[PDB]
Amino acid sequence: AAAASLQGKLQCFIGSTPLWDPYYPTPVFQVLAAAPTYTLSASVTPAVV
Amino acid sequence: AFFGADTGTAPADLAAWLTAANGAGGLTATILPSSIPSDIISFTRTYAAAAASLQGKLQCFIGSTPLWDPYYPTPVFQVLAAAPTYTLSASVTPAVVPVDTATLWTYNIIRSVPVPAGGPSLPILCSFWDGKTGAAPTTDAGWAALAGSANGKGTSMAPGSTTATCSFTPSYSTTGTATPTLQLIQNSFALDAATTVGFLSPVYASYTISSYLNPVTPVAGGAAAVWRIVITRNAAVTASAKTLTCQMPDNGQGGSPADVTADIAVGGTTTVCVFSIAGYTTATPGPYFATVNVVDGAVTTSHITKNFTVLASGTTAPTYAVTSVVSPATPVKVSTPVTYTFTITRTTAVPAGGIPQPIICEFFNGEGTAADTVVAVMAPGETTTTCTFTTYYTTVSAGGFTAKLMVFGE
Amino acid sequence: ATTVGFLSPVYASYTISSYLNPVTPVAGGAAAVWRIVIT
């Protein structure tokens, strides 16, 4: 189901030690929603080329 | 009878022109009596080789007598040549357009082959399809029939001039991804045939609300207050009568008022929505929000948020005192300025930091009918409101007159 | 590769100066050199 708010969690390990410390929170990304459509327009100066 | 320069030499003598007119080569035309006639006559000429300068000669005869005196020269017309191609261009301001907004378009008409000197101007009728109908004309008959109407405008190419400007302003019903279609047609009198040269492709509202509440004071055990919402639109309602859905979100007093659907008369930008809360008599003083959804055309669901701080008066009923005074005073002469100052005070002076109640004061002098209507916003702090007026009495005293001020909270 | 919205098409001079060196044509002399610049 399409969700309004995404929060992905990634954790990496070089060997055993993790890169992201547990004390500070894991990275969170807000990844948009609802798939909007972009309506473009155009303005030109001058007419003749 | 007409004789082109290409087909054959024009006859030298009037008798030969008369013979040609009496025969088949000269065509006959009928003039309507009791009217100024606009006689249109159409000949047929085929040039085997294109000529840069045309010299036609036509001679006419009403009865035996010819119309064109032979002493004065015969009509000769240099009617252009070389069949130029028109390279059009498009300038537009602005790019995006709101609903019912005017857009500026300017198209420069360019002619490759210069107009020969001593020739008639070139009347071009540019056609504009604003796009309200839905279907742009494709053929030359659907475009030439639009040029004649007000939808298309005219322009004259000067002899020897190539550049030509043509500005127009289209109207749209709803904001769509469409632009006014162009067509470049020249036509003869009475729109007989259809001929096109150059075709062209496409080149790609706000709402305010001012809500006021009357009475301002919640009277616990009193008449229910009337909230009035004034919705203005930047563009005028052009096509049809609109229906906006005012929705008052619950302020925590007497539930959410029922949503109103006010119908606006055609050509009316402003609309008034009337809400009535019964439990507002016991309303807690604080700031409350109110969002309204406006629907109009293609731009749907426009949300307008407005703030308002409802105070709580309680069970006390406030009153508005009104005092009057006149500066010029007795005795005033007929037809002289007379200043009437009215002070509309409120001893309780309840509005602390919430809704200001502007007052519209309608003056009325003692004329006899029983009005220079002016408005004055009541500043929440300063309870004193001044209505200045001038009357210009135009009748005798008859003892004395009495002014009658009226006040309205709307 | 990903796309969202599509769109449709949205629709020199030369000046010359010419001088002559020498200005005066001398009968029985060097041919006059005419120079022309076109900017």
Side-chain angles (χ1 to χ4, degrees):
Chain A
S5 61
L6 310 179
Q7 314 64 348
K9 292 175 187 179
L10 177 61
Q11 196 73 215
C12 295
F13 296 85
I14 298 183
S16 34
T17 312
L19 295 179
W20 319 132
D21 47 35
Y23 272 98
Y24 279 89
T26 58
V28 183
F29 333 115
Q30 199 29 281
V31 185
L32 315 188
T37 55
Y38 316 107
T39 69
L40 302 179
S41 69
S43 171
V44 55
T45 304
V48 172
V49 196
Chain B
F2 178 84
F3 283 92
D6 60 306
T7 56
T9 313
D13 56 70
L14 193 77
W17 290 96
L18 176 57
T19 310
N22 293 324
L27 302 171
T28 314
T30 307
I31 279 176
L32 209 29
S34 315
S35 65
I36 299 162
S38 174
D39 210 330
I40 289 167
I41 165 62
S42 304
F43 275 87
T44 36
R45 291 298 179 205
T46 312
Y47 293 61
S53 62
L54 309 179
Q55 313 54 20
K57 296 184 181 179
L58 163 43
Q59 200 84 226
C60 295
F61 298 86
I62 207 64
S64 51
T65 317
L67 291 181
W68 320 131
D69 278 324
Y71 270 96
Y72 274 87
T74 57
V76 182
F77 322 83
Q78 316 53 240
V79 201
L80 317 190
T85 57
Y86 315 110
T87 69
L88 303 182
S89 63
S91 267
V92 57
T93 302
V96 188
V97 197
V99 192
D100 282 284
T101 308
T103 319
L104 179 58
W105 312 83
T106 313
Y107 305 90
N108 154 37
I109 307 166
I110 305 171
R111 193 189 152 114
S112 63
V113 181
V115 171
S121 296
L122 199 71
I124 309 178
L125 298 185
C126 294
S127 296
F128 320 117
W129 182 73
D130 58 342
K132 284 180 163 169
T133 55
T138 165
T139 86
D140 304 0
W143 277 127
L146 199 69
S149 71
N151 312 35
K153 306 293 177 180
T155 183
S156 53
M157 191 145 288
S161 297
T162 58
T163 55
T165 314
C166 173
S167 302
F168 91 95
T169 304
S171 58
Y172 332 122
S173 184
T174 70
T175 296
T177 65
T179 82
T181 311
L182 256 189
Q183 191 79 320
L184 207 81
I185 302 192
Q186 179 171 350
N187 62 329
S188 300
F189 331 120
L191 211 29
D192 81 335
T195 301
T196 52
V197 194
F199 199 6
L200 274 190
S201 100
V203 185
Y204 52 78
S206 56
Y207 286 93
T208 58
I209 298 182
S210 56
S211 56
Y212 66 85
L213 181 47
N214 172 219
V216 175
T217 61
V219 190
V226 177
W227 207 18
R228 303 182 192 277
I229 282 167
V230 179
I231 317 179
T232 313
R233 188 182 185 243
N234 68 325
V237 168
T238 51
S240 55
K242 308 300 178 187
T243 306
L244 315 190
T245 313
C246 289
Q247 302 189 338
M248 169 35 197
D250 193 1
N251 48 3
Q253 322 295 318
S256 192
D259 297 324
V260 189
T261 56
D263 302 323
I264 318 85
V266 278
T269 206
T270 307
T271 185
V272 187
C273 286
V274 171
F275 291 85
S276 181
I277 320 163
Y280 166 91
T281 55
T282 67
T284 310
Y288 311 100
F289 274 119
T291 206
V292 177
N293 299 24
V294 175
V295 174
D296 198 303
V299 178
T300 321
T301 70
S302 295
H303 307 272
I304 310 163
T305 310
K306 74 202 91 63
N307 317 345
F308 60 98
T309 307
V310 168
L311 86 171
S313 59
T315 63
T316 299
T319 182
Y320 286 84
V322 277
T323 304
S324 62
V325 68
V326 284
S327 189
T330 294
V332 153
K333 310 300 294 184
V334 288
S335 195
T336 88
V338 196
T339 307
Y340 284 69
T341 48
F342 292 93
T343 57
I344 308 98
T345 59
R346 191 190 215 167
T347 312
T348 190
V350 294
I355 302 157
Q357 183 182 340
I359 48 138
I360 296 190
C361 54
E362 277 82 340
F363 175 86
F364 172 70
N365 61 329
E367 201 75 351
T369 88
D372 201 44
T373 304
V374 78
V375 55
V377 289
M378 171 95 78
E382 184 157 10
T383 192
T384 65
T385 321
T386 61
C387 284
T388 56
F389 290 110
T390 184
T391 185
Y392 283 130
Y393 282 105
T394 185
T395 51
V396 298
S397 61
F401 292 132
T402 65
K404 293 184 191 174
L405 192 80
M406 254 325 319
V407 178
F408 290 107
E410 293 85 292
Chain C
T2 307
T3 56
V4 194
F6 44 100
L7 275 190
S8 194
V10 189
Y11 66 83
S13 61
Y14 288 91
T15 59
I16 299 181
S17 55
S18 55
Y19 63 82
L20 184 37
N21 176 210
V23 167
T24 59
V26 190
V33 178
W34 200 308
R35 308 186 185 277
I36 283 166
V37 59
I38 314 177
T39 176

